Design a protein around this nucleic acid. Structure first.
Lengths: 59, 138, 113, 117, 156
RNA sequence: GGUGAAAAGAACCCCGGGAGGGGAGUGAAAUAGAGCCUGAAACCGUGGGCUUACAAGCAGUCACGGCCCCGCAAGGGGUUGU
RNA sequence: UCGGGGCUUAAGCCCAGCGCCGAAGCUGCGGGUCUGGGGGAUGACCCCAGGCGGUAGGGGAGCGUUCCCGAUGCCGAUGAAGGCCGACCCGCGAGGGCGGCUGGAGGUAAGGGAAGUGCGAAUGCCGGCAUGAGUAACGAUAAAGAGGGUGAGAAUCCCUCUCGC
RNA sequence: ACCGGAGCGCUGUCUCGGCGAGGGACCCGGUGAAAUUGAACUGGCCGUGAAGAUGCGGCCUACCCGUGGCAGGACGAAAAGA
RNA sequence: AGCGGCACGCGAGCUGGGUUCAGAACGUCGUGAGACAGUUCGGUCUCUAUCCGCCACGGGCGCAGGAGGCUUGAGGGGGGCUC
């Protein structure tokens, strides 16, 4: 509600495209050695672990 | 009845001179050939008009002072981008253009008018890629 | 067979959850499980839970064995819209909408013979 | 006497909508945009009918000319002969004998330049 | 009309820099509950029709039924003591089927007591023997007196 | 404003904090499931048929080509390269 | 930049002959329509001639809707009214029949009649859903950091330590 | 705390701007409006046109869609022109 | 120490000093309220760019085997002074 105001409606397809380069994005996982599950890369899993795996006190 | 529709016709290559011919008079013909308009089986919407390879363009002739006179313009979107080269220098550097040009504006323009220009392959020479038929003409 | 579990009458606007769904659309239970564990949109919680309940039907009802379970159709169709008012000055009470959606995961089985 | 319209209008609009159903843009689901577009479409249909006439007249005459030169010479002459012969038809439509069965044609060519060539 | 609304008479908007429309009361027709235009009102349709003309109506109409041969002047209906079944048996006997209505022109109320209930017998009486009912019905089952009514009615 | 003829208005197991759902079960019907009869359009979804990454537009018209689905034929509908 | 192109005994200018193109104009074939005439008592129906761009606007006809006479009747649970689908039929049309799907109890022919009747628009009235835009903003620049705890779920709640206004 | 003229000192007012600041802007997640909106499939030149065009002729540049950024134009939005 | 065009270029880019708002006065005309190409002092340029266009930057596809690495110059832009 000031100077710049859309002059004529935006067509559905346009909305679509603006959101074409949008859209959701995949995750990516890595195998946990000395364990058996998935973790983010170089991270630690409270179910798996790093070297030695500090914590891992899941009930 | 219902007027006839050529099926997938084979593309007949040709070959024309260059040297000695008048620049414009040439295309006039050449053009027609690029389309099916010589063919007794022409059709607007298909482009089956003869692949015209051309030899020794560099020796195209033309009338009057057009050698010097005639100006080949080119304008980038940049303000002041108008560059006008003369027929003269246009012979000297990449002369093949001059034909291809005189030509390219004797076709129509819808997406196939340019498909047709691809159906044309001049050289300044003779020489060409002897691919096949290309029966000389006149 | 197949396994139906809809998420009717649920908070959050479509676009967001519509985005959440299409990422996992048509995949394994194990797979999508691990995906949901590591995706960053509250949809993650919602879709994951409703997907798990979609698997829950296929356990004690229709039964197609959990091993074979693959995901079909997950659509997320908009519901109504919550209508509230916005503190915009100069005398105008704007209108604001907290939308609601319909996540619908249907996970069938592996083979068909 | 509740002269309540009813649904009448919705039905009529359904008609014209179905008439336009297919076009690109909301004009395929807008029962007013559909109307305007439709208007254009119909007037177009009429014009394109008379235009269809001279269109195909032309195309015929095109292959006729090119093939005429292929055998002997120009279309103008060809026809002029056919006329100053007695061939009170040839049927520009079916002048396209050149298309299928060039023998017929070339014979009529002989008859053409014979007429008054 | 639009005038009778328990509503305002004061313009809701300015009349210029509103940005909106340009109106006033919510009793105008173009709004929601706002009144209608020239329509729903208490209007009697009745009019005047010349004597003799419409008189002839009866005449003509009644006379037309005499071309249609369905009428008679029973001096007395044997359905004495207004019971349905009496005049019913009398109907069967006098040639009254069960599928032709009775503008039953006649005058004794006891007779029409039975006819006051028959469902293919409107029971028409004489003091208001009318053309419309003559057309929708079937039986000039007149007593002599009803015909005296139809007689004195004309007089020309 | 309106479930249904009638509350017979959903026990029980299932996942889930619930929310809500999946059978069970209710009735002729639960696509009558609780502001629920009947569910137009705008309206945003989802699957599939056609088409689109040299391409100039009041967006369709007309014809030619091809792709899919129809049809016993001949014919058709849908689509759009030109 | 003559529209362009390209043309220099011309594809320019002038002048002569013939040809062809090319308009919805005109010829033909077919159906409608209107005026006159004729056959037909013949209404119907056919032959013939001539008109049929068109805003305001004048004349003629018709489709449809809401209710009444028609209705103590006619239609209908084997299924009314809408609703959805359509490449069939009839009418120039507006519509009507048909059929498939839906739905659940009203509907009304032929003939007449009574009218709040036919929407695309009035920065028109109400209601609904979008557009921008997953963008601007999410309220003071005094400011937050960690430990444990509750819990299905802790930046956002609570106990402690630390910082700052 | 009213309008000029002058002079000193002083100073990023200027020559002429360069870094630095934190906070907004930009990327992650939670929430998420507005005016305007005939429909759009929206480059340019040169003419035209009711006289100032992506839509018309002639004739134009450039694959398809986006992010940040500027503001000439859409006779830009808000004012049924004071 | 050129002249001129482009809405006598440019306020969705700035300024608002000049301008033709309401105050007041000044010279001034009018019996007068008020008015005067006559003057004077003050006085609110509206954060969010939808499409085009421009400048930088990417994602997809492309190039009729699949990957790296090094190139070629179509066309276009800049640079051209001067004591």
């Amino acid at each position: 509600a000031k100077h710049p105001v859309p002059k004529k409606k935006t067509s559905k397809a346009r909305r679509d495209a603006r959101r074409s380069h949008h859209a959701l994005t995949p995750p990516t996982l890595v195998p946990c050695p000395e364990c058996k599950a998935m973790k983010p890369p170089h991270t630690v899993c409270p179910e798996c672990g790093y070297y030695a795996g500090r914590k891992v006190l899941e009930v | 009845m219902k007027t006839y529709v050529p099926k997938q016709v084979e593309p007949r290559w040709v070959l024309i001179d260059a040297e000695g011919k008048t620049l414009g008079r040439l295309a006039t013909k050449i053009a027609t050939l690029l389309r099916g308009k010589h063919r007794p089986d022409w059709t607007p919407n298909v482009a089956m008009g003869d692949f015209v390879v051309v030899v020794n363009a560099d020796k195209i002739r033309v009338t009057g002072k057009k050698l010097e006179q005639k100006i080949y313009t080119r304008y980038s979107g940049y303000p002041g981008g108008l560059k006008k080269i003369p027929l003269e220098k246009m012979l000297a550097t990449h002369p093949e253009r001059v034909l291809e040009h005189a030509v390219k504006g004797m076709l129509p323009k819808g997406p196939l008018g340019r498909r047709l220009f691809k159906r044309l392959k001049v050289y300044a020479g003779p020489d060409h890629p002897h691919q096949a038929q290309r029966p000389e003409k006149l | 067979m197949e396994a139906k579990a809809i998420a009717r009458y649920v908070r959050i606007s479509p676009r967001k959850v519509r985005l959440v769904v299409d990422l996992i659309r048509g995949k394994s239970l194990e797979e999508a499980r691990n995906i949901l564990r590591y995706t960053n949109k509250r949809g993650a919680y919602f879709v994951a839970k409703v997907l798990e309940s979609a698997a829950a039907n296929a356990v004690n009802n229709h039964d197609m064995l959990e091993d074979r379970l693959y995901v079909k159709a997950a659509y997320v169709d908009e519901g109504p819209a919550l209508k509230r008012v916005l503190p915009r000055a100069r005398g105008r009470a704007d209108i604001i909408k907290k939308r609601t959606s319909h996540i619908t995961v249907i996970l069938g089985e592996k083979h068909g013979k | 006497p509740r002269a309540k319209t009813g649904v009448v209008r919705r039905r009529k609009h359904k008609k014209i909508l179905k008439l336009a159903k297919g076009y690109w843009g909301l004009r395929s689901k807008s029962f007013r945009k559909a109307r305007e577009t439709l208007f254009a479409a119909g007037n177009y249909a009429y014009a394109h009918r008379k235009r269809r006439k001279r269109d195909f007249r032309r195309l015929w005459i095109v292959r006729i000319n090119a093939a005429c030169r292929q055998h002997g010479l120009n279309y103008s002459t060809f026809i002029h002969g056919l006329k100053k012969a007695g061939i009170e038809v040839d049927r520009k439509n079916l002048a396209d004998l050149a298309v299928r069965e060039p023998q017929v044609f070339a014979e009529l060519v002989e008859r053409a330049k014979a007429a008054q060539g | 009309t639009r005038g009778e609304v328990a509503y305002s008479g004061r313009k809701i908007w300015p009349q210029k820099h509103t940005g909106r429309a340009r109106h006033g009361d919510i009793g105008a027709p173009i709004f929601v509950g706002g009144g209608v235009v020239f329509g729903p009102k208490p209007r009697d349709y009745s009019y005047t029709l010349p004597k003799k003309v419409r008189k002839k109506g009866l005449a003509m109409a009644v006379a037309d039924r005499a071309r249609e041969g369905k009428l008679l002047l029973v001096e007395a209906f044997a359905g004495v003591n207004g019971k349905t079944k009496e005049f019913l048996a009398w109907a069967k006997e006098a040639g009254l089927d069960g599928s032709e209505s009775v503008l039953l022109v006649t005058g004794n109320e006891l007779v029409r007591r039975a006819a006051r209930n028959l469902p293919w017998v409107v029971t028409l009486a004489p003091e208001g023997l009318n053309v419309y009912d003559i057309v929708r019905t079937e039986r000039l089952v007149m007593d002599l007196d009803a015909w005296e009514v139809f007689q004195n009615r004309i007089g020309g």
